[PDB]
Design a protein around this motif. Structure first.
Motif, PDB file in Angstrom:
ATOM      1  N   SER A 148       4.351 -11.363  -2.602  1.00  0.00           N
ATOM      2  CA  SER A 148       2.981 -10.956  -2.890  1.00  0.00           C
ATOM      3  C   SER A 148       2.297 -10.424  -1.634  1.00  0.00           C
ATOM      4  O   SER A 148       1.432  -9.550  -1.707  1.00  0.00           O
ATOM      5  N   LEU A 149       2.692 -10.955  -0.482  1.00  0.00           N
ATOM      6  CA  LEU A 149       2.119 -10.535   0.792  1.00  0.00           C
ATOM      7  C   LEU A 149       2.634  -9.156   1.192  1.00  0.00           C
ATOM      8  O   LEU A 149       3.832  -8.884   1.115  1.00  0.00           O
ATOM      9  N   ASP A 150       1.722  -8.292   1.622  1.00  0.00           N
ATOM     10  CA  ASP A 150       2.084  -6.942   2.038  1.00  0.00           C
ATOM     11  C   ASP A 150       3.075  -6.978   3.198  1.00  0.00           C
ATOM     12  O   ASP A 150       4.035  -6.210   3.232  1.00  0.00           O
ATOM     13  N   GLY A 151       2.833  -7.877   4.148  1.00  0.00           N
ATOM     14  CA  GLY A 151       3.711  -7.995   5.298  1.00  0.00           C
ATOM     15  C   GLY A 151       3.570  -9.331   5.999  1.00  0.00           C
ATOM     16  O   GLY A 151       2.941  -9.423   7.054  1.00  0.00           O
ATOM     17  N   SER A 152       4.155 -10.371   5.413  1.00  0.00           N
ATOM     18  CA  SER A 152       4.086 -11.710   5.986  1.00  0.00           C
ATOM     19  C   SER A 152       4.797 -11.761   7.335  1.00  0.00           C
ATOM     20  O   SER A 152       4.180 -12.022   8.366  1.00  0.00           O
ATOM     21  N   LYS A 187       7.911  -9.247  12.007  1.00  0.00           N
ATOM     22  CA  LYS A 187       8.922  -8.217  12.216  1.00  0.00           C
ATOM     23  C   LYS A 187       8.773  -7.094  11.196  1.00  0.00           C
ATOM     24  O   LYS A 187       8.138  -7.269  10.155  1.00  0.00           O
ATOM     25  N   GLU A 188       9.361  -5.941  11.501  1.00  0.00           N
ATOM     26  CA  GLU A 188       9.293  -4.791  10.608  1.00  0.00           C
ATOM     27  C   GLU A 188       9.853  -5.135   9.231  1.00  0.00           C
ATOM     28  O   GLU A 188       9.356  -4.658   8.211  1.00  0.00           O
TER      29      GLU A 188
END
Length: 18
Positions: A10-14, A17-18
Motif C-alpha cells: 500500500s505504501l508508495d515507497g516504504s 532503497k530504490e
C-alpha cells in the motif's frame, strides 16, 4: 504474507532503497 507484502504494498515507497 509479509510485513511489506502486506504493508509496503500500500505504501508508495516504504523501503528507503530504490
Amino acid at each position: 504474507s509479509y510485513q511489506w507484502q502486506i504493508f509496503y504494498r500500500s505504501l508508495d515507497g516504504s523501503g528507503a532503497k530504490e
